[PDB]
Design a protein around this ligand. Structure first.
Ligand code: GXK
Length: 387
């Protein structure tokens, strides 16, 4: 059986879920798209602003009783993506998912919209498009699994959504900073494969009020975890005014490709070449630098790179600057290096950069913080967000 209401069709047997006041969601079609079709009693009293990572409400039609609303169809929630056993990613990896979620949020904030209740239940994973690709999209309605059915609601604290309360309830009208906190919590949730940064649910609110977060799954000597921690801690900062904007989160190293990581190192090295050892920039760079370099970096690299460097009496092993200079030197002269050196370093850029970030897990985090001094400069505008 089939119901046609203008440009929207659906089969009444294909029920996906139920909502309040006899609202119902069916699977259907609109304009050769598979869509969710929400049927509602009408309540009384912008296509040009669409974005791939915010859910689309395509069309509204009506018969004599109901309105029918065509809505962009999801395969799963982020809750299911993260939690379900053996869930196929289908080519959508966590960092990309979070990247897309933050883009949708930056878009909403660019329109002066605050979500206020961003959680795993309302970040939806799309059906695969014509090109076999899936995406994250932020929804106003959250979905909670209940066989082949889901409850949908816009409300915070409905059954199923208990450990994710709207941040405004744990505290001025809501600003972007509530969304960033929630995003920060979602970031950790995905990365930790289901944990909350404010602990188990019975103590979670109490922990949020005091800023007692614990990012235990992030190892303090792994480059990827050092970067993720750096960002996530800023996003869930107890003080709302220290939280970065969505566009600011998007510029963070957490999202940089290996090529971009290597280019950053190359650029700071170029920037600090003629800089005096006693100037403000090199001082910022050498402060706390002994731990970053593992006291002597020349004792923490491979024997073939060690041997090739021995000629360079210039490079000091206690120095963060000289490690960056050694890196930039060997990237620039890579072609002309001995076979054994190209082999130990591996290919440009991906193996090369990982040679150093695996050995020196604080190098990028430390260099990123230190080089904020040059953030307004033209060369570094790709790496930092400006107000
Ligand atoms: Cl019950 C439901 C189920 C969906 N997919 C199929 C399930 C395997 C996952 C699904 N995809 C989008 C929506 C949706 C999205 C925004 C809405 N606003 N009001 C109602 C809305 C409904 N749903 N709902």
């Amino acid at each position: 059986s089939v119901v046609i209401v203008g440009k929207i069709s659906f089969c009444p047997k294909d029920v996906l879920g139920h909502g309040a006041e006899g609202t119902i969601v069916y699977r259907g079609m609109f304009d050769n798209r598979d869509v969710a079709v929400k049927r509602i009693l009408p309540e009384c009293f912008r296509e040009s602003d669409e974005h791939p990572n915010v859910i689309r409400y395509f069309c509204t039609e009506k018969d004599r009783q109901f309105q029918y609303i065509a809505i962009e169809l999801c395969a799963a929630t982020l809750q299911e993506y993260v939690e379900q056993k053996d869930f196929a990613h289908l080519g959508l990896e966590p960092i990309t998912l979070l990247q897309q979620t933050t883009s949708g949020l930056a878009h909403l904030h660019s329109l002066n919209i605050v979500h206020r209740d961003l959680k795993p239940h309302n970040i939806l994973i799309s059906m695969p498009n014509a090109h076999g690709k899936i995406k994250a999209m932020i929804s106003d309605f959250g979905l909670c699994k209940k066989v082949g059915r889901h409850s949908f609601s816009r409300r915070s604290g409905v059954p199923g959504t208990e450990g994710w309360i709207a941040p405004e309830m744990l505290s001025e009208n809501p600003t972007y900073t509530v969304d960033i906190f929630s995003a920060g919590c979602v970031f950790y949730y995905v990365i930790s494969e289901g944990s909350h940064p404010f602990g188990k649910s019975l103590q979670r609110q109490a922990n949020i009020l005091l800023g007692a977060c614990s990012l235990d799954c992030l190892h303090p000597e792994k480059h990827e975890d050092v970067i993720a921690r750096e960002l996530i801690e800023k996003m869930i900062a107890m003080d709302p005014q220290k939280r970065p904007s969505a566009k600011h989160v998007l510029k963070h190293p957490f999202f940089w490709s290996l090529e971009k990581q290597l280019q950053f190192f190359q650029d700071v090295s170029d920037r600090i070449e003629k800089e005096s050892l006693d100037g403000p920039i090199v001082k910022q760079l050498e402060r706390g630098g002994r731990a970053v370099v593992k006291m002597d970096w020349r004792e923490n690299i491979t024997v073939p790179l060690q041997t090739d460097l021995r000629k360079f009496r210039t490079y000091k092993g206690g120095s963060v600057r000289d490690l960056l200079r050694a890196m930039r030197n060997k990237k620039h002269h890579y072609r002309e290096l001995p076979a054994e050196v190209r082999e130990t370093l591996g290919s440009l850029p991906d193996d090369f950069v990982c040679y150093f970030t695996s050995r020196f897990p604080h190098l990028l985090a430390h260099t990123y913080r230190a080089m904020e001094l040059c953030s307004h400069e033209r060369l570094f505008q790709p790496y930092y967000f400006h107000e």
